């Protein structure tokens, strides 16, 4: 009977191989990189192609539905618009480039006169990030953000580095002006990724200067 | 004061 089970496995191996070969010759290339917009339930998703056309997919395709999530950038067939393969993000290369590790060392000895401003951000950053254990017991939620408003020439980008440098952290500076790209759905991707690139790394600060560029 | 405004069209 051991031989009989082996025969069933041998047959299965050929059919698994044959199905794999048909999928292999139907994977092919190139893939239209689309952006899953949502997932209606009633195994079918609404792909919004990069060509600026939406295409509901009756079957999500050669992927596991549970893996696909609203926002995933999958590779789909240019004609059928069936999701072929999930495309890895890796936070592109630009996104990781905005992780400058050369904070110019704007040591608080280098920023002057803005002390109460200096100590205040150390209360809402640095302190909240560094000594979070006490922050957790107190119940005092540390405000995740701080907007830097004031007449130009006050040095907002400067104390920002000060909290950036003399407080460690990663400091993914994402100045708003850069987040204006004529390529549809790029800065937004740069945004979600930036926080995505942000989650990967250890305690850091996502700094966006000139927020008017997208703050309009 | 109250300012009426024209507009262009980025193609």
């Amino acid at each position: 009977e051991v031989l009989r089970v082996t025969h069933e496995l041998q047959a299965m191996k050929d059919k698994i191989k044959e199905n794999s070969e048909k999928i292999k010759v139907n994977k092919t290339l190139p893939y239209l990189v689309s952006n899953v917009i949502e997932l209606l339930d009633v195994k079918c998703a609404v792909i919004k192609t990069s060509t600026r056309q939406t295409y509901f997919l009756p079957v999500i395709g050669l992927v596991d539905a549970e893996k696909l999530k609203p926002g995933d950038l999958v590779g789909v067939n240019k004609d059928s618009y069936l999701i072929l393969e999930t495309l890895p993000t890796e936070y592109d290369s630009r996104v990781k480039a905005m992780e400058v590790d050369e904070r110019p060392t704007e040591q608080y000895s280098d920023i002057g006169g803005l002390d109460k401003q200096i100590q205040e951000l150390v209360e809402a950053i640095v302190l909240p990030m560094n000594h979070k254990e006490k922050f957790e017991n107190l119940g005092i939620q540390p405000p995740k953000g701080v907007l830097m408003y004031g007449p130009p020439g006050t040095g907002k980008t400067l104390l920002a580095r000060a909290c950036a440098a003399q407080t460690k952290a990663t400091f993914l500076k994402l100045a708003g002006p850069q987040l204006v790209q004529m390529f549809i759905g790029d800065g937004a991707k740069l945004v979600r990724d930036a926080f995505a690139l942000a989650k990967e790394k250890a305690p850091s600060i996502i700094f966006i200067d000139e927020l008017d560029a997208i703050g309009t | 004061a109250x300012x009426x405004x024209x507009x262009x069209x980025x193609x």
Binding site: - | X6, X7, X8, X9
Partner: protein, 51 residues
């Protein structure tokens, strides 16, 4: 307009005042072109205080 035997065009009030700049000038350009290829013509602009 009831006795004219001449194409009687009617531009009245704010019909030449278009939001996009350089479009108001265009319409009047095409209005005096449709009034020449169809001449003799009479452009009747009512409420000229508007424009």
């Amino acid at each position: 307009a009831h006795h004219t035997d001449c194409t009687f065009i009617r531009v009245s009030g704010s019909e030449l005042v278009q939001k996009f700049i350089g479009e108001g000038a265009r319409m009047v350009r095409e209005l005096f072109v449709m009034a020449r290829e169809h001449a003799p013509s009479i452009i009747f602009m009512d409420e000229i205080d508007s424009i």
